[PDB]
Amino acid sequence: FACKTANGTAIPIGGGSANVYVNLAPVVNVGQNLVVDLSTQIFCHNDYPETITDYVTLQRGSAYGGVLSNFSGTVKYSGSSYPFPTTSETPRVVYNSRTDKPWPVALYLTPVSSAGGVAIKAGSLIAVLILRQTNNYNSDDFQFVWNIYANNDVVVPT
């Protein structure tokens, strides 16, 4: 089991950490959602699916910078929504293909009334998402750390 980003940065077998720089909707009005869809940014595969089934959870998701202070929201993992920042590890998703497939994670964030104009600053850390991988084969328990950075400013107009 291993993963890569959209620009080709890999976290190999055994886990690790990587930085992910995502483009964000530059304008989010009150009432709208800011969607940070990592399923187009993070991909993973199973290295021997005929014998081994890989299990993959979102173990923890933390918010930082303007996402912490200016938004309220949730994380959607494989069709289910949970609080964000997370309070517990999600259920497992099955990976059973050698073809790199998306990690189905997305943040759904809406501005709080006290949000400031410049809600997210370009280049800032906005989230840390931990992918935890196990299997039905041995005792492997590996954490893939995804550090999410904003590519651009996000403004919430009045």
Ligand SMILES: OC[C@H]1O[C@H](Oc2ccc(-c3c(F)c(F)c(F)c(F)c3F)cc2)[C@@H](O)[C@@H](O)[C@@H]1O
């Ligand atoms: O994604 C599958 C596994 O890939 C790595 O662990 C491997 C253990 C065994 C084999 C393997 C196998 F199971 C076979 F049946 C083979 F024929 C073979 F050549 C293999 F290399 C490949 C990867 C780790 O990330 C682990 O954590 C993961 O579960």
